[PDB]
Design a protein around this ligand. Structure first.
Ligand SMILES: CN(CC(=O)N1CC=C(c2c[nH]c3ncccc23)CC1)c1ccccc1
Ligand SMILES: CN(CC(=O)N1CC=C(c2c[nH]c3ncccc23)CC1)c1ccccc1
Lengths: 372, 388
């Protein structure tokens, strides 16, 4: 059938989850112009003629497509190894967002340029109240850009520093992390390193997970990094136990001065896991921490989220699992302005000119995403 | 500007068939990149090897979904050229017969000639004229460019002129259809540069259409462009700047050959022909024993004259008003409705009686050397794909 094959082709060209969608195919042409336009390369007739034929329209497309210049940087609200997070405002729409930038130079230099694909897909397609949304994803020759919802409530590292977390609060945050992880697991993904930095609080003080691509890592994720083991969803449930312990105790359960010491304490969890002498912690809170901080064969979460939800630590009279997001969060942030950075602490290299085709833009083809 | 205006202008560039960057040209770029990068020496670059792993699967899936040579069943080879051949083909699924023109990418790259086909592709795809051979689909693989066009079973006008003594009544019909065909091409901004009976094909009802635009060049904002019997004097002076009227000279040669039986500037030697063309004011003569009207002689002389005063240099309207076209069978708006002088008798949708059936070759699949660095041999063909 000719029209069935022609229809299937249009499906691939218009589906946002397709690698050959219209905005993805445009990335290939854009990358090709960035990577070919060098004097040594343009000596090749095929290259010089192709660029003459497409540099007018590619420069035109670069202007029409979303670009960094469409955003007004307000402040830098975060920083990482490969870039930074900026609170930005779209010039035309005036809407504020959080934009994550990833340096193509650093990524290529460190030979690490494929870690962002699952983060892009989870945030773009989750469609969940528990996952930070990615509205747009674009790029230029130097950076990858991720336009996400701004989470003014800050992160849980900040919350834990500013407050003495009572059990009533710890139960709320732990339950929201349980629902957030279940939404991610339902999509077919495993977070791997769930930590308080990945837990962001929206305008109403409710939690959403962000940042998909040592203290919080499970024993199986450590073992499997030596190229022989394997792990399941229960590796994220281990992280929940570490988070609950840090919240009620003030320290990570396997803290050590050295990275080796932490790694070793995690493997020796049956002997290193201890609750300080001066612990006001309930028996149900300790039960839940121990049920998560154990080997994967007997870990809570092995037989789904239901056994986690039924734990006595979650028994309370303020909320229910099915309506938890409608309840008032323990810390509802001060909604002063759309530019409020109160909950956040405040704080370039060009590629060498190629003498042959290097293709530095190739590992980024297909990153562009427009939610419409 | 407006944001939604930017994202609407984008969707226009992505849908417009005449756009350099519609979704077919964009898939061409990705398909060209997978061909040009999938070599073991290039796969040593991590960026290249990783990109190919990420897209090899979908590019092969897309190659199957998109139109390909295997969708067509070859029936005969009805024509041949330096860079390829023309095959009478039948679509496997639809069973409809077409004429497919193939152009060898190796012969093209090897001879450093890989940009002549763009005008032919655009004329046949966008002319939208009852007088220009239509291009339904255009596709490609790593070895060939393919052009799926309407099959013209009636043959060409060289064949028609050999088999018949063309009366004026017939010559007027064929000249009239060539005038409408050249005007469609001129309206698009092109100059044929090689109008001869070889380019004029007859369809299943005997109606004429132009084909063979390998020689086509696009005019500038002032209408200028950069066999020997059909060539105008302005070209022989260079052999520069040529207007529309260099095509109208060939119409005059065509009309003379039709009514007389010989080309107006025939000679044993090429030099004798070139000399006769330059001396057109004295060499152009009509045989004493003729059934040529004063209006046919007027039209031929109006075309076979200096480009500074030639009929056509200011449009087709003055040509259409010529008294030679006055007749009682048809009008310019009723020409294609008329019964053509020679309506071909066809046994089947596959009948090739009006063509010299040719022997297929199926032997030269020559190789470009395996790239040790990025060569980009598929780059001059990005954007050739067309679907109607
Ligand atoms: C600091 N990171 C971590 C990260 O990947 N993320 C941290 C949290 C995000 C966020 C979403 N919405 C936000 N709203 C207010 C502040 C941060 C955010 C996005 C994800 C980072 C790492 C490497 C290179 C660059 C940045
Ligand atoms: C013979 N040339 C000219 C050519 O390009 N064309 C001549 C013939 C065509 C045709 C359309 N429809 C047809 N139907 C019945 C016969 C021929 C046709 C189309 C155009 C050629 C040159 C190089 C490589 C290959 C062929």
């Amino acid at each position: 059938s000719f029209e069935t094959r022609f229809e299937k082709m249009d499906n691939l060209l218009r589906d946002p989850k397709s690698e050959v969608n219209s905005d993805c195919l445009l990335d290939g042409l854009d990358a090709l112009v960035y990577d070919l336009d060098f004097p040594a390369l343009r000596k090749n007739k095929n290259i010089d003629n192709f660029l003459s034929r497409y540099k007018d329209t590619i420069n035109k497309i670069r202007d029409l497509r979303m670009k960094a210049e469409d955003y007004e940087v307000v402040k830098v609200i975060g920083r990482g190894a490969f870039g930074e997070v900026q609170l930005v405002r779209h010039k035309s729409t005036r809407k504020v967002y959080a934009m994550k930038l990833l340096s193509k130079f650093e990524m290529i230099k460190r030979s690490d340029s494929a870690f962002f694909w699952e983060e892009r897909d989870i945030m773009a397609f989750a469609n969940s109240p528990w996952v930070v949304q990615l509205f747009y994803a674009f790029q230029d020759d130097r950076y990858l850009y991720m336009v996400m919802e701004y989470m003014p409530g800050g992160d849980l590292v900040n919350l834990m520093s500013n407050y003495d977390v009572p059990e009533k609060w710890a139960r709320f945050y732990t339950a929201e992390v349980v629902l957030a992880l279940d939404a991610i697991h339902s999509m077919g993904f495993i977070h791997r390193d769930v930590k308080p930095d990945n837990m962001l609080l929206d305008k109403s003080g409710h939690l959403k997970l962000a940042d998909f691509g040592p203290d919080y890592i499970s024993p199986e994720v450590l073992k499997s990094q030596g190229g022989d083991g394997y792990y399941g969803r229960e590796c994220d449930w281990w992280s929940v136990g570490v988070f609950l312990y840090e919240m009620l105790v003030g320290d990570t359960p396997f803290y050590a001065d050295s990275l080796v010491g932490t790694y070793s304490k995690i493997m020796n969890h049956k002997n290193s896991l201890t609750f300080p002498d001066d612990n006001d912690i309930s028996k149900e809170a300790k039960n839940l921490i121990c049920a998560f901080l154990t080997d994967r064969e007997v870990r809570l979460g092995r037989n789904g989220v239901e056994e986690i939800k039924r734990h006595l630590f979650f028994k309370n009279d303020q909320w229910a699992w099915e309506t938890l997001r409608d309840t008032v969060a323990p810390v509802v942030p001060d909604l002063s302005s759309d530019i409020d950075t109160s909950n956040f602490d405040d704080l370039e290299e060009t590629f060498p000119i190629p003498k042959a085709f290097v293709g530095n833009q190739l590992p980024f083809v297909g990153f562009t995403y427009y939610s419409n």
